[PDB]
Amino acid sequence: KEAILAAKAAGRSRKDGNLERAMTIMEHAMALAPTNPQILIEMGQIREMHNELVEADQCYVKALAYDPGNSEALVLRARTTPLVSAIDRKMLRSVHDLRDEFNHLQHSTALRRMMRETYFLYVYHTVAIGGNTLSLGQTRAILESGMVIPGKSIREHNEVIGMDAALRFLNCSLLSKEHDEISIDDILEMHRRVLGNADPVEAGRIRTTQVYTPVSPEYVMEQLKDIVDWLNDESTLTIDPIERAAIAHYKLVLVHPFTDGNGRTARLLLNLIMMRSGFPPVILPVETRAEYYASLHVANLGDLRPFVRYVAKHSEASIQRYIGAMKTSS
Amino acid sequence: PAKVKEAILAAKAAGRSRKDGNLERAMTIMEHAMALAPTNPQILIEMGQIREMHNELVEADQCYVKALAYDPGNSEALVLRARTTPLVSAIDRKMLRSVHDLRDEFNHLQHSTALRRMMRETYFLYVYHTVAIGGNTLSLGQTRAILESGMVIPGKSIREHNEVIGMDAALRFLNCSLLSKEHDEISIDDILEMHRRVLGNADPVEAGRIRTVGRFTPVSPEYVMEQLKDIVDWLNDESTLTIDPIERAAIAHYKLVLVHPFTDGNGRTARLLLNLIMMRSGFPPVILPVETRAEYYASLHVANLGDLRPFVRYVAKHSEASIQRYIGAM
């Protein structure tokens, strides 16, 4: 346990004139229960020698969240945070420049490719991240043929169906410019469509028993109205669109107002906000599932920046996917 | 220009000349004349009289009622039906009393294993039959695999599965919430959650929801909801407790079908309400088999001409058939 703290002292001895031996020792004990800033602070440093600034800063922030007042974590972070903020501002800059670089050609192939295949990709990825064993071809087969895929449960089918319904509602009621006000009944309807076919008793329904690192208590509603008011507040136009969507998703998944269907509706609200800010559909792929959940847990420790970097990561990845998609078109 | 095939004016002039010649041949001639002009008043009159001499009084009366409804003011039909009416009223009371006695010796049955087996078993046959009248192509064995085995039939429609499931959870709700003697009432929300149960999985957006003065629309939620209020008030009024439960259920089914309060699933909810009334008067689940679908609508047809008696005879027949299924099971 605390024995290997002397191996954080061994990476302390190595770190002075070393290469990957310090990383050899710290890899080890690091995987031996990260909780004491003693190992997380030192690992932050060893990361920093590799010019891994944001990961170091993460180790410091986590050492502080677990040990409020740990002053070596405090000082090291006070030195790392401004650079990390500059880097994140840069990342958002880049993804926006790519965004309005994207808004140039409205070919019929953009219609064809994006409108259809990114629809089926979004459905498949959102339901799949929630453990759905369906493939993309099976998902679209469900959507346009309505028959049953062999070897799959009925509830998976109903997850795909409900996701399709919720997307339809979001597009033909919440993505219109004439209705520039997001109501709370709109969120309730989005969840009712998400979970309607799979679980009719709890679709569009606020949980009574608010079970459990817990979640806000039996007073969710007023917080839902808080979310809605913040979305419709006039100061939120100054905030970066990507961080706006990420904060909405965050706010929501922390409120956790439904017994089930929270993650899908959260990704839905994120996608809605980003699409109304001129962005194409943002796809959080299933292969990155791990990191996704990972970042969210860090978000519950007081640090939303990993999740923001994740959303920017895959939004820019999707946009560049598209530019590179019709650069090989022609 | 209502024109009639010539071959039957000749068949109408011929039939006028004989009955009394031992001519069964007249019945088959008038039957071939029934297959081409089913709405011809004189053919229905004659066919009725043939049914009279053949000592099938109820069907003769039916031909008279149908001829009079098709030809308002036809006094021939008026006098013939004036002869037949009291006799068929008597016959109907005979039938109802018989069904009620058989039902009284159904409630005097003491069985342990076979009974419940059968109960759960019934539990399923009802779903299959009530959805098969609705146009569901799922087999009884497929429905049974879905509900009882948690199986799924690939290559078949997803919504058929969801209709079976919704109807099953519905019947569960009726048995374990609406038959508790602590109720003894029928609120509008009982019908509304029975509908939310019927269409919950198949169509969650409109399940448990009623179909939709500055404009001029004939349909608005307050009016349709108001008609539902009239229905439930009629159901819980004590004067309507004095009528035979079979007629109470049939009239309720008719009223609910004609109010048309939901966008879809009205027929399933109507047969379900019929079953609810029947069961609260001590009857086993009344299954209207899909093999009799025709007769079903046929009776309802006569219902819209002003005669609910064929429908009452129908639901009485199949109620006795259900009871006799349970009774013959041991």
From Swiss-Prot, chain A:
Question: Residue ranges of the Fido domain?
Answer: 182-313
Q: Does the keyword Endoplasmic reticulum apply?
A: yes
Query: Which GO BP terms, alphabetically?
Result: defense response to Gram-negative bacterium
Q: Which residues carry this modification: O-AMP-threonine?
A: T208, T328
Q: Where in the cell is it found?
A: Endoplasmic reticulum membrane; Nucleus membrane
Q: Where is it expressed, tissue-wise?
A: Ubiquitously expressed, with high expression in the germline.
Motif segment (Inhibitory (S/T)XXXE(G/N) motif): 126-131
Q: Which GO terms describe its molecular function?
A: AMPylase activity; ATP binding; hydrolase activity
List the GO cellular component terms: cytoplasm; endoplasmic reticulum; endoplasmic reticulum membrane; nuclear envelope; nuclear membrane
Alphabetically list the UniProt keywords: ATP-binding, Endoplasmic reticulum, Hydrolase, Membrane, Nucleotide-binding, Nucleotidyltransferase, Nucleus, Phosphoprotein, Repeat, TPR repeat, Transferase, Transmembrane, Transmembrane helix
Q: Where is the active site?
A: H256
**Primary site of residence:** endoplasmic reticulum
Q: What is its EC number?
A: 2.7.7.108, 3.1.4.-
How's its activity regulated? In response to endoplasmic reticulum stress, mediates de-AMPylase activity.
Query: TPR repeat ranges?
Result: 3-36, 37-70
Catalytic activity annotation: L-tyrosyl-[protein] + ATP = O-(5'-adenylyl)-L-tyrosyl-[protein] + diphosphate; L-threonyl-[protein] + ATP = 3-O-(5'-adenylyl)-L-threonyl-[protein] + diphosphate; 3-O-(5'-adenylyl)-L-threonyl-[protein] + H2O = L-threonyl-[protein] + AMP + H(+)
Site location (Important for autoinhibition of adenylyltransferase activity):
G130
List ligand-binding residues for ATP. Answer: G130, D260, G261, N262, G263, R264, T265, A266, R267, Y292, Y293, N300
Q: Read off the domain note.
A: The fido domain mediates the adenylyltransferase activity.
The free-text function statement in the UniProt record for this protein reads: Protein that can both mediate the addition of adenosine 5'-monophosphate (AMP) to specific residues of target proteins (AMPylation), and the removal of the same modification from target proteins (de-AMPylation), depending on the context. Adenylyltransferase that mediates the addition of adenosine 5'-monophosphate (AMP) to specific residues of target proteins.
Family listed: Belongs to the fic family.
Q: How does it assemble?
A: Forms homodimers; homodimerization might be required for adenylyltransferase activity.
Q: What is this protein called?
A: Protein adenylyltransferase fic-1
Q: Which organism is it from?
A: Caenorhabditis elegans
